[PDB]
From a paper:
The alg operon also encodes a periplasmic lyase, AlgL. Our in vivo studies demonstrate that AlgL does not associate with other alginate biosynthetic proteins and functions as a periplasmic homeostasis enzyme to clear the periplasm of accumulated alginate to prevent cell lysis.
To investigate how the H202A and K66A active site mutants might affect enzymatic activity and account for the discrepancies between in vivo phenotypes and in vitro catalytic activities observed, we determined the structures of the AlgL H202A and K66A variants. K66A and Y259F retained approximately 1% and 30% catalytic efficiency, respectively, compared with WT. Similarly, we were unable to observe any corresponding density for the mannuronate substrate soaked into the crystal prior to data collection. K66 interacts with the sugar ligand and appears to contribute to loop enclosure in the WT enzyme. Mutation of K66 and the resulting flexibility of the lid-loop region suggest that K66 in AlgL is important for priming the enzyme for catalysis by locking the lid-loop in a closed conformation after substrate binding. This could explain the abnormal cellular morphology observed in vivo in the K66A strain and the reduced enzymatic efficiency of this mutant variant in vitro.
Numbering used by the authors: 28 to 42, 49 to 65, 82 to 362
C-alpha cells in the first residue's frame, strides 16, 4: 500500500513572491562559523523561505502563496541543486538537512485534504523527483559506516529520508530509515545513554536531546504505515527520552557520566523540545512531559517542516 504521513498532514488549507535564491549546484565543500553561514547562505535562505511560504499557504489558503512555494522548490528541483558527488562531512550534512526541511514542508501540500497540488501536477512531479534523487543520495552519504561513526547526523539523515519516502512513495527509502532507527535504538545502553553522544563531553545532554526529534518523527511515521518501533531495544526511544528529561531537570547525571559540567545553551530554547509532539503521540506521556509540551506550544522547527504542533493535532 501507498506510504502515508501522520493524520495531521491531511489538514485542510485555511483550517507577491520574492526572487528565488540562486539554486546551489556547486560542490558541497563547506567550513564547519561566519564563513560557514556565508558559504551556505542561498541554502539557508531557501530552507527558511520555502518552509515559511508553505506554512503561510496552509494557514491562509491564498493561491499566490502556493504558486510561490512551488516556484521556489521547482527552481531548485529543475536546476539539480545539492546533487554534487564532491562533498565533505559538512556539505553532506547540509544536503540531508535541506532535504529534511523542504520535504517536511512539501508533505503538508502533498497530503492536505484540500489537494492544492491537483492544479500543479508538472511542478509537483519536478519536486518529488528532486526529493527522490536527494533521498537516494543521502542514503549513499551515511551507509557503510561502523557504529563508531553512527551519531546524530545519521539519525537526522534517516528522518530526511523517511520524510522523502512518504512524499515520493518510496518503500526502499522507508526501509532504510527504519533500519537506521533500529541501529540507533541499539546504541541506547541499559541507562538510556548513546555512547557516541557521551563523547560530546559538556554538550552530551544537548546532543542527546538533538537525537530525539529525528528518531521520534521516524517512530511516528513508521507507526502510521504499520511498523511499530516503540518497543525496539526494550523501548530505547522512551528510555533515551526519559533520561533526557531527568538531565534537563537535574544536570548531575550527565556530569557524573562525562565528568563535566553541561552547557545548557541548547536546552534553553523551546524549538529544541519539539520532539514532545510526535513522542506524546506515540507514548502515554506523564504530567511532567505533557506540561513541558503544554507551556512551549505551538512549536515551529524549520528542520522538521515548520508547524510541528499543527501536524500532531
Amino acid at each position: 500500500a501507498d506510504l502515508v504521513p501522520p493524520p495531521g498532514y491531511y489538514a485542510a488549507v485555511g483550517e507577491s513572491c520574492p526572487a528565488v535564491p540562486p539554486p546551489y549546484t556547486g560542490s558541497l565543500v563547506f567550513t564547519s562559523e561566519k564563513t560557514f553561514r556565508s558559504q551556505i547562505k542561498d541554502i539557508t535562505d531557501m530552507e527558511r523561505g520555502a518552509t515559511k511560504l508553505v506554512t503561510q499557504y496552509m494557514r491562509s489558503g491564498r493561491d499566490g502563496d502556493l504558486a510561490c512555494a512551488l516556484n521556489w522548490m521547482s527552481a531548485w528541483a529543475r536546476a539539480g541543486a545539492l546533487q554534487s558527488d564532491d562533498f565533505n562531512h559538512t556539505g553532506k550534512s547540509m544536503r540531508k538537512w535541506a532535504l529534511g526541511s523542504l520535504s517536511g514542508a512539501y508533505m503538508r501540500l502533498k497530503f492536505s485534504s484540500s489537494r492544492p497540488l491537483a492544479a500543479h501536477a508538472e511542478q509537483s512531479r519536478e519536486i518529488e523527483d528532486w526529493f527522490a534523487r536527494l533521498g537516494t543520495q543521502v542514503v549513499r552519504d551515511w551507509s557503510g559506516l561502523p557504529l563508531k561513526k553512527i551519531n546524530n547526523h545519521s539519525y537526522w539523515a534517516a528522518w530526511s529520508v523517511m520524510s522523502t519516502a512518504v512524499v515520493t512513495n518510496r518503500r526502499d527509502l522507508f526501509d532504510w530509515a527504519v533500519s537506521e532507527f533500529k541501529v540507533a535504538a541499539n546504541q541506547v545502553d541499559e541507562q538510556g545513554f548513546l555512547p557516541n553522544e557521551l563523547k560530546r563531553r559538556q554538550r552530551a545532554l544537548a546532543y542527546h536531546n538533538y537525537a530525539l526529534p529525528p528518531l521520534a518523527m521516524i517512530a511516528a511515521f513508521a507507526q502510521v504505515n504499520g511498523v511499530d518501533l516503540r518497543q525496539e531495544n526494550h523501548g530505547a526511544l522512551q528510555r533515551l527520552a526519559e533520561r533526557v528529561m531527568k538531565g534537563v531537570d537535574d544536570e548531575e547525571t550527565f556530569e557524573e557520566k562525562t565528568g563535566e559540567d553541561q552547557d545548557m545553551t541548547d536546552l534553553k530554547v523551546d524549538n529544541k523540545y519539539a520532539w514532545l509532539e510526535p513522542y506524546c503521540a506515540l507514548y502515554r506521556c506523564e504530567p511532567k512531559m505533557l506540561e513541558a509540551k503544554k507551556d512551549r506550544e505551538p512549536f515551529n522547527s524549520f528542520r522538521l517542516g515548520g508547524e510541528v504542533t499543527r501536524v500532531f493535532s
